[PDB]
Design a protein around this ligand. Structure first.
Ligand code: HEM
Ligand code: HEM
Ligand SMILES: *[C@@H]1O[C@H](CO)[C@@H](O[C@@H]2O[C@H](CO)[C@@H](O[C@H]3O[C@H](CO)[C@@H](O)[C@H](O)[C@@H]3O)[C@H](O)[C@H]2NC(C)=O)[C@H](O)[C@H]1NC(C)=O
Ligand SMILES: *[C@@H]1O[C@H](CO)[C@@H](O[C@@H]2O[C@H](CO)[C@@H](O)[C@H](O)[C@H]2NC(C)=O)[C@H](O)[C@H]1NC(C)=O
Ligand SMILES: *[C@@H]1O[C@H](CO)[C@@H](O[C@@H]2O[C@H](CO)[C@@H](O)[C@H](O)[C@H]2NC(C)=O)[C@H](O)[C@H]1NC(C)=O
Ligand SMILES: CCCCCCCCO[C@@H]1O[C@H](CO)[C@@H](O)[C@H](O)[C@H]1O
Ligand SMILES: CCCCCCCCO[C@@H]1O[C@H](CO)[C@@H](O)[C@H](O)[C@H]1O
Ligand SMILES: CCCCCCCCO[C@@H]1O[C@H](CO)[C@@H](O)[C@H](O)[C@H]1O
Ligand SMILES: CC(C)Cc1ccc([C@H](C)C(=O)O)cc1
Ligand SMILES: CC(C)Cc1ccc([C@H](C)C(=O)O)cc1
Ligand SMILES: *[C@@H]1O[C@H](CO)[C@@H](O)[C@H](O)[C@H]1NC(C)=O
Ligand SMILES: *[C@@H]1O[C@H](CO)[C@@H](O)[C@H](O)[C@H]1NC(C)=O
Ligand SMILES: *[C@@H]1O[C@H](CO)[C@@H](O)[C@H](O)[C@H]1NC(C)=O
Lengths: 551, 551
């Protein structure tokens, strides 16, 4: 079998076979040397001595509110700290990208073929003696047994960080522009060839789709007006393909950039809000530029909404998730004197870790109604009946579920949780602890250390036998949360590098794009740099209801 | 008409309309301010005082051979200087890319759509009063008159730098992997979606083409043996499409990665040499890695040949062209402490400036034969008859034509030279002097200043009236050459940024790729770092004939 099956090289050293039964580790620029890249250079020894653990840094960031209150109000200091957050996180991501599901060695095919998700760790080779390499049993435990014993919800567990359904549906809407698995090809393939925040879930992945969604007047997107309210246009009107069951009324087959967004009314809620936002920005640019044509109005509005998106994701969405007293900043200028690649490739493991289905409540509570999953799915009538204003008021008030901590996946989506496990295995993912090492975390030494409790830990012990073959996805959902937090350590320390790299890697953040003229002047630039989740709702939802990502 | 038609903003500032007849310049990070970005900041003033002209620096690099001989032998100093050549040239290129033929403003369409060549300067807007904006006559001079008066060859003018036909066909073969215009769409469109040195001209642009060209044993490319010599396989054997006239017999339709390389036996000579090199490297890797399969052998050899290509282009090809006494270096490590983007988009203007057809001789002289263009084109019989050893010996001896200095386009390709002019206009290129300012050059103040003489200058004066509407492409070919040089100032100062950025921008030059394990270990790595045009010929051509890019 492959000599690298045991994953011998440490500290991001790379393993290469050098014969049928021999390997060599390439320790180049790891800060380590020796056969397995485990002997630290002098400087590396010193660095390791002084480095705080993630849990220590997390502590500091979530305490001393009074100090952070001062720090937040000193621009130079706030910039310094945000610059360090961006650079230190982004360093953990290979860019240009390297591995994918078919290539555990660098190749021009892996580099150039955008239909692959990339891989933060290479796949376990096909001929390895066990699923995780050489450790553990010949087969992993039955994925249904793992699902049922430690993932499925008994009683709803609320997010102690107070995340609401505005947050949950924003997470789903936002991420599904770059998590778009090409199931015809397999789980390691994506249909999101822009590999990031290009707003294809509003505008369409292809030019043909985009042009069917556009009005071709004033830069705007097509729309319909039902009961005096602006909604996306229909499938029949646009000839845009959408996923809908056969029984859906013609005028409820809303057509939007992302074909799956008819799945759930919470998605259609944001699709509608962003469509309105695009057309609003068109109106503003037309006022500013009476001389501009439709094409420039459309393109410049798209750039502005991309900037708005990144602004809101950092300063509202990630701010909320972080739990930090430090005030995050969206500021491309922070990187202009740093080394940083303005490109990104979406990682399979980023997709996996973002399967946050424990957020979902047992019912969807709008106004006085409590809808079941069966009532809520593919049902845009609910959106039309209550209206956007009521959707926002209700979802702002409704608490979402905790993601880490175990046993909180709604049984309505149990098949999704099982697929995340089955597809992880199909893509030959390395183990939880290999991923922890990859992101500078200490391997867990027991199941009880992983969960912080005894009962799930024992079920896991019996299923997996060795902590070193525990799987990434179920680990994320059973991991001991930070104190009163929605996530455990592995979720944040993997998620944050992927997230921030992906956000700042966008070309609009590069120096030649990050200028007023890119966005039609100071007016368009300011739309980006003053965007918030509250302003997005205030500008585009009748009555300007209050909103927030927390209850 | 468009308010920016006159190109009012200077020093890389960006022009935006602000009403039907007003404009605003965005001077962000130009080092200048004021209505047109022409007022220097203080630091800027100082820099402009200290900065030597391109002609001055060129003079320095091409004299003092004794001093350079010392510098070339001080590793530290060589590295310092080469590093500054790389960063200073690359800084001139927008990366991530910006404009293209359809977008004179930044847009997501222009950023994301890889079918476009990018544009170093935006197109002249469609409603401008004159072709170049507001200056000059309503129509540009007849391109047939420009061609005949100042471009077409009378007597053959040999290159004073002694470039040979090994050089001319290397330029053609190498560049035609990333200059591949998509004529179905138009001159501003490319079929080279890798936008760089990906060796698609050997391996094919698409995966389907690649797999038809591959043997699927030992990593190798398919081939045939003719008289004991290895040649590319045929179209019939591979089902790989090629462009050939109907009279070419089945046995002479060689199939290689680039569809057009059957056009000229000089291209097919390099196609054969590189095909042999791929299979040679496969043999080496297989010795080092008996445990490897065909796919990894194939992919690793491709990465090695990409490295060889960049190595040879810098240290042989560009070295020769430069005329410098300084010894250039291919060393990705020079950029590891620098700000640099490992990406590139091929510019239309890079394509245009590389139309180096004056290199071509009046006849192609192999052994004792002198082939006309009519006899040479599409004639792979010539290659089989003389063989590669004789091709190399003959092309190494045969001098190529001077490119700058006027009147040296071969009449056999007058239609190509006319097309370069006509297509530049179709793509709405800005004038020569706009491009000179874009690359930090002083505008020419007269046609005599451009040509360094009187006769051609007066013909151009009559044709164009105003030096500020002189076109880029014909100016390149009539420009006053550097002393005893193949090119004038504009060619080098535009060409060098595009070239070096494109070479170092390749992902194999990035830190996570530039490691021995990427290339199958130290033996694979050393193949890249010792590659040369002589070793390429020596290893793959019977008898190891001596070669170089000069006569
Ligand atoms: C009513 C709400 C939801 C339903 C019915 C639902 C259902 C599904 C289904 C059926 C899949 C396909 C999985 C497969 O078999 O391959 C999926 C994928 C996924 N879901 Fe959910 N989900 C919901 C909410 C959410 C939320 C709130 C998030 C938060 C981020 C989320 C994140 C994801 C991700 C990242 C994927 C992978 C997408 C891809 O690769 O294309 N989902 N979901
Ligand atoms: C016998 C030798 C050659 C012949 C017959 C030839 C002929 C042609 C022709 C017919 C075109 C297409 C022009 C059009 O778009 O209408 C072309 C394009 C071009 N040629 Fe040549 N040429 C030769 C040698 C060279 C050499 C030595 C170079 C050196 C750099 C060169 C550089 C180019 C470039 C860069 C293009 C544009 C390619 C593209 O846009 O796809 N050619 N040539
Ligand atoms: C990116 O990589 C994808 C995975 O390799 C690749 O998809 C694969 O494409 C090949 C070749 O086009 C398909 O194989 C085909 O060729 C044989 C002929 O011998 C047919 O019998 C097959 O049915 C098929 O037509 C694979 O089917 C396909 N694999 C998957 C999983 O989709 C993409 O083409 C690559 N993308 C680019 C842009 O290169
Ligand atoms: C490099 O790592 C390998 C593990 O992959 C080490 O070899 C193993 O060492 C353990 C105990 O240390 C033994 O139980 C195994 O039998 C060893 N495996 C093999 C294949 O020999 C190796 O010692 C490490 N090298 C260094 C220098 O620390
Ligand atoms: C990149 O841009 C070109 C130019 O617009 C696109 O080519 C057009 O495609 C549409 C349909 O998508 C056709 O109706 C046009 O005839 C095409 N025009 C030309 C000039 O080719 C191309 O599709 C775009 N590529 C991507 C991936 O979106
Ligand atoms: C007090 C907070 C100062 C800046 C906090 C940076 C937050 C992210 O810093 C992270 O800390 C981890 C553990 O030390 C490291 O492993 C990561 O590389 C680093 O990105
Ligand atoms: C020996 C001095 C170092 C060699 C010079 C680097 C080669 C390219 O130097 C060039 O010189 C031009 C004029 O100054 C500039 O306009 C270019 O931006 C710069 O790249
Ligand atoms: C070596 C003699 C040629 C130099 C004369 C300059 C060319 C101007 O003459 C042109 O030459 C073209 C090519 O033959 C012809 O097709 C045109 O009909 C002719 O006008
Ligand atoms: C977990 C990930 C998906 C979201 C996330 C959460 C926190 C952070 C902060 C700013 C950090 O970098 O520590 C970034 C991104
Ligand atoms: C003109 C271009 C196509 C070729 C070329 C010529 C010279 C140089 C040197 C290294 C420089 O930067 O001055 C680079 C590239
Ligand atoms: C769809 O929603 C409506 C309310 O708008 C509800 O009454 C109806 O029962 C739902 N449909 C299904 C199939 O549950
Ligand atoms: C700026 O450009 C215009 C031409 O567009 C010119 O008239 C003006 O004098 C220039 N300089 C200043 C300082 O405005
Ligand atoms: C092709 O070259 C051969 C020499 O190998 C020559 O005899 C023949 O005439 C040429 N063909 C044409 C059509 O010129």
């Amino acid at each position: 079998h492959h000599p690298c099956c045991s994953n011998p090289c440490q500290n991001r050293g790379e393993c290469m076979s050098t014969g049928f039964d021999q390997y060599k580790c390439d320790c180049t620029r790891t800060g380590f040397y020796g056969e397995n890249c485990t002997t630290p250079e002098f400087l590396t020894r010193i660095k390791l001595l002084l480095k705080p653990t993630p849990n220590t840094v997390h502590y500091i960031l979530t305490h001393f509110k009074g100090v952070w209150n001062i720090v937040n109000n000193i621009p130079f200091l706030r910039s310094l700290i945000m610059k360090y957050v961006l650079t230190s996180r982004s360093y953990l991501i290979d860019s240009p990208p390297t591995y994918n599901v078919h290539y555990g060695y660098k190749s021009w095919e892996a580099f150039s073929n955008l239909s692959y998700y990339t891989r933060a760790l290479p796949p376990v080779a096909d001929d390895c003696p066990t699923p995780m390499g050489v450790k553990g049993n010949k087969e992993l435990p039955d994925s249904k047994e793992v699902l049922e014993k430690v993932l499925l919800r008994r009683e709803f567990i609320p997010d102690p960080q107070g995340s609401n359904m505005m947050f949950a549906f924003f997470a789903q809407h936002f991420t599904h522009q770059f998590f778009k698995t090409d199931h015809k090809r397999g789980p390691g393939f994506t249909r999101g060839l822009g590999h990031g925040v290009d707003l294809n879930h509003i505008y369409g992945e292809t030019l043909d789709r985009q042009h069917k969604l556009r009005l071709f007047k004033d830069g705007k997107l097509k729309y319909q007006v039902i009961g005096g309210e602006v909604y996306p246009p229909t499938v029949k009107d646009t000839q845009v393909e959408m996923i809908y069951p056969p029984h859906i009324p013609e005028n409820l087959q809303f057509a939007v950039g992302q074909e799956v967004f008819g799945l759930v009314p919470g998605l259609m809620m944001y699709a509608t809000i962003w469509l309105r936002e695009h057309n609003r920005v068109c109106d503003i640019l037309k006022q500013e530029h009476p001389e501009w044509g439709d094409e420039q109005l459309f393109q410049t509005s798209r750039l502005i909404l991309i900037g708005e998106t990144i602004k809101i994701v950092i300063e509202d969405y990630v701010q909320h998730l972080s739990g930090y007293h430090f005030k995050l900043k969206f500021d491309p200028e922070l990187l202009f004197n740093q080394q940083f690649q303005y490109q990104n490739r979406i990682a399979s493991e980023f997709n996996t870790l973002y399967h946050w289905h424990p957020l979902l409540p047992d019912t969807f509570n709008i106004e006085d109604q409590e809808y079941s999953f069966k009532q809520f799915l593919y049902n845009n009538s609910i959106l039309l009946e209550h209206g956007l204003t009521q959707f926002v008021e209700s979802f702002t008030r409704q608490i979402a579920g905790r993601v880490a901590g175990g046993r909180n996946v709604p049984i309505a989506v149990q098949a999704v949780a099982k697929a995340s496990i089955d597809q992880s295995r199909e893509m030959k993912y390395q183990s939880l602890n290999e991923y922890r090492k990859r992101f500078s975390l200490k391997p867990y030494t027991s199941f009880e250390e992983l969960t912080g409790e005894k009962e799930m830990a024992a079920e896991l012990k019996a299923l997996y036998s060795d902590i070193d073959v525990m799987e990434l996805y179920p680990a994320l959902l059973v991991e001991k949360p930070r104190p009163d937090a929605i996530f455990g350590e592995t979720m944040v320390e993997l998620g944050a590098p992927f997230s921030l790299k992906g956000l700042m890697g966008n070309p609009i953040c590069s120096p030649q794009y990050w200028k007023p003229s890119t966005f039609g002047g100071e007016v368009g630039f300011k739309i980006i740099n003053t965007a918030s989740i509250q302003s997005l709702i205030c500008n585009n939802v009748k009555g300007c209801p209050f909103t927030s990502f927390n209850v």
